[PDB]
């Protein structure tokens, strides 16, 4: 046994740390460099200019750093980035950018993406984040930490997907969801907030009610999205937790003089 | 001439029947047991502990037997069952048990798994099932005799869906499918019973009639659960074909004390 | 050479010159394949199967293989694939059936895009798009300039009408007509596909033209009967009206009642 397959493909510019793992029929594309421990499947076909982190698992028939097909795209050198301790399962295809955004798709660190899930061009994953099966990020998406997309969750381009936030399965997303926040249905409505993730994360029980009060400001007291912020002001200033949950809804909402 | 591509990989510990065939480039794992006439195509991945019986027919893109990435199992040697004549098409994903339930993922005979479907683990096929392109079961779910889940069907963890019954497309389902009955949306309701399903198994035409005053006794006419289980006794006893539907809601419905 | 020595060609495959295949490639069969197409790794093609001119087909395809459909007893079908299509990762095409025209069918310039599924007897135009995991269960017809967007599922025997388009997770079971815009599971009509109208460059007297179209259909009390005899002298005035009149009308022949 040798680390890397007789029976893959290297191509000579690529840059894999020492002890990677590469199984039979993969294609380790030019310009792809992989970090320490990392190990790809059998069946996996990376593209560059890619850079990978460290102790990332990727399993067969996936296609990572593929160019998009939007017509938008005209084979300009854009780039993905994947960090540390990521998994990502059979199937998954993920895109590099394009030159009309940051002509980068980068993913953190510690992320599960399931399998089948899409990654689009110019999407943004931070860390702790699960994309679970066929979950579909559009385009210019950010997926802000801890973020659980269930299963067949599509997302519109340019939504962002708020902190510990929670959709549903089957949940067709077409605007931000706010930090916290679980929603449901085709089109995605609200339905409340995700404490089991509050609990796992062993936010206090103060924080906990707070958040509540918070949803209940913005969701279920006739206010507009302007009134709600006013009125979470305070609230935002006595816990950390809410502010995250405030600044999700301030930079969702410019709106237009009127 | 051998039955095994030689581009093929074989564990030295997997045991494959006499006249299996296995195309170029797949992987079977450690552990694999292949059943007598069995073809697993090119480009499949199994893995173990995995037991496949006879007459099996396994498409490109497969992966039988992996692990779940659920962060409740810890790597124990869980199994996977598969029985006789059953079809799995391309980039089917099927995962082994969890040591939290019965340790096994399960599948019966004669049963049609269509493209890009997945099985959770723990979840129990019968037999003459089928599941249409990218059904998804999401963990721990049953599924009886000649179901038919149309494509896209989404299945929540736990959920057992019932002899004879359909699901539309595009279902997402969340609670327990009664035998017989057709559920559509996300989320799933129910709207008639699968006669198309009776004529097929050529049941009576007195049978077929019990069977819907039963959805009718159920659904359409303001009984709680309870009333409407005691209103099926009676033909309950009259056909086996209404028993199956009475005994499918009898198993969903323990509740709580009131 | 342009065919990898790890690929797999059938005897009775039948390449053109300049056709590129990648590693672990399987042309199958009775497979033909057209000057300048490129088939990627990881793909599988099989027949009968006639693929035209300039073609990309990206890894994890399964091209040309049989339906499950239990309808299907092995009879020799075919799949036909025009010139300048792009279909990508992890796409499935089955081939017909004898109880329709034994033949599953794709023009010229479409984009198929990754997952997405074309059932048997689908016969699709030019110029569409398919968006990640569309699936046509089976004789769909989809005619030119269509946009499909991601997860949309259709019933078998819909037809999806020229410059119509599907928001995502849509799912049809009746036909669009011809440039509506369709939302939901099930499917509902909302509006018209004007930004498709832009991109064509379609006169502005038909835009307009259309819109009031859509209005005498969908938002006037009309039948369906009513709404085609109101729609004949506009459909006589405009090329463009008169697709929208025609997916209908062809859609709706109904019983004698
Ligand atoms: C266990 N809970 C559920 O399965 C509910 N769920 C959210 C979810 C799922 C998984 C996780 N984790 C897995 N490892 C750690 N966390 C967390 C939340 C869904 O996505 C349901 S749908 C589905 C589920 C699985 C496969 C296909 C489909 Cl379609
Ligand atoms: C033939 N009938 C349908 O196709 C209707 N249906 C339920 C269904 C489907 C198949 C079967 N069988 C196949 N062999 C025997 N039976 C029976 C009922 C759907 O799943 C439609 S959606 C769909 C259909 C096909 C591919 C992708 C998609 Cl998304
Ligand atoms: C950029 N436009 C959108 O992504 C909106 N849209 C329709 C659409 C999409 C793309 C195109 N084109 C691409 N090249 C040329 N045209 C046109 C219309 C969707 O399908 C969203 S869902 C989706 C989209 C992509 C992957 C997975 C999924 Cl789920």
Same mark, same amino acid.
């Given at each position: 046994?040798?680390?890397?397959?007789?029976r893959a493909?290297?191509?000579?510019?690529?840059?894999?740390?020492?002890?990677?793992?590469?199984?039979?029929?993969?294609?380790?594309?030019?310009?792809?460099?992989?970090?320490?421990?990392?190990?790809?499947?059998?069946?996996?076909?990376?593209?560059?200019?890619?850079?990978?982190?460290?102790?990332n698992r990727?399993?067969?028939?996936?296609?990572?750093?593929?160019?998009?097909?939007?017509?938008?795209?005209?084979?300009?050198?854009?780039?993905?980035? #994947? %960090? *540390? !301790? =990521?998994? +990502?399962?059979?199937?998954?295809? /993920?895109?590099?950018?394009? @030159?009309?955004?940051?002509?980068?798709?980068? #993913? %953190? *660190? !510690? =992320?599960? +993406?399931?399998?089948?899930?899409? /990654?689009?061009?110019?999407? @943004?994953?931070?860390?702790?984040?699960?994309?679970?099966?066929?979950?579909?990020?559009?385009?210019?998406?950010?997926?802000?930490?801890?973020?659980?997309?269930?299963?067949?969750?599509?997302?519109?381009?340019?939504?962002?997907?708020?902190?510990?936030?929670?959709?549903?399965?089957?949940?067709?997303?077409?605007?931000?969801?706010?930090?916290?926040?679980?929603?449901?249905?085709?089109?995605?409505?609200?339905?409340?907030?995700?404490?089991?993730?509050?609990?796992?994360?062993?936010?206090?029980?103060?924080?906990?009610?707070a958040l509540?009060?918070?949803?209940?400001?913005?969701?279920?007291?006739?206010?507009?999205?302007?009134?709600?912020?006013?009125?979470?002001?305070?609230?935002?200033?006595?816990?950390?937790?809410?502010?995250?949950?405030?600044?999700?809804?301030?930079?969702?909402?410019?709106?237009?003089?009127?």
């Amino acid at each position: 046994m040798s680390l890397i397959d007789p029976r893959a493909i290297i191509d000579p510019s690529a840059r894999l740390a020492a002890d990677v793992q590469v199984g039979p029929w993969s294609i380790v594309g030019a310009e792809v460099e992989i970090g320490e421990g990392t190990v790809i499947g059998p069946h996996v076909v990376l593209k560059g200019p890619t850079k990978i982190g460290k102790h990332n698992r990727i399993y067969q028939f996936s296609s990572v750093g593929e160019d998009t097909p939007d017509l938008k795209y005209k084979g300009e050198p854009t780039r993905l980035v #994947i %960090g *540390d !301790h =990521n998994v +990502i399962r059979e199937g998954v295809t /993920i895109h590099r950018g394009t @030159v009309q955004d940051r002509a980068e798709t980068t #993913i %953190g *660190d !510690h =992320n599960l +993406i399931m399998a089948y899930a899409h /990654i689009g061009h110019d999407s @943004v994953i931070g860390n702790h984040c699960i994309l679970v099966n066929n979950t579909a990020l559009a385009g210019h998406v950010h997926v802000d930490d801890w973020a659980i997309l269930s299963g067949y969750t599509l997302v519109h381009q340019y939504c962002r997907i708020g902190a510990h936030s929670f959709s549903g399965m089957g949940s067709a997303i077409g605007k931000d969801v706010p930090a916290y926040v679980t929603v449901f249905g085709n089109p995605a409505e609200a339905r409340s907030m995700n404490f089991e993730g509050m609990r796992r994360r062993g936010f206090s029980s103060e924080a906990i009610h707070a958040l509540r009060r918070a949803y209940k400001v913005v969701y279920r007291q006739g206010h507009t999205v302007e009134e709600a912020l006013a009125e979470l002001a305070e609230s935002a200033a006595q816990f950390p937790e809410v502010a995250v949950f405030r600044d999700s809804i301030q930079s969702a909402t410019r709106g237009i003089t009127r």
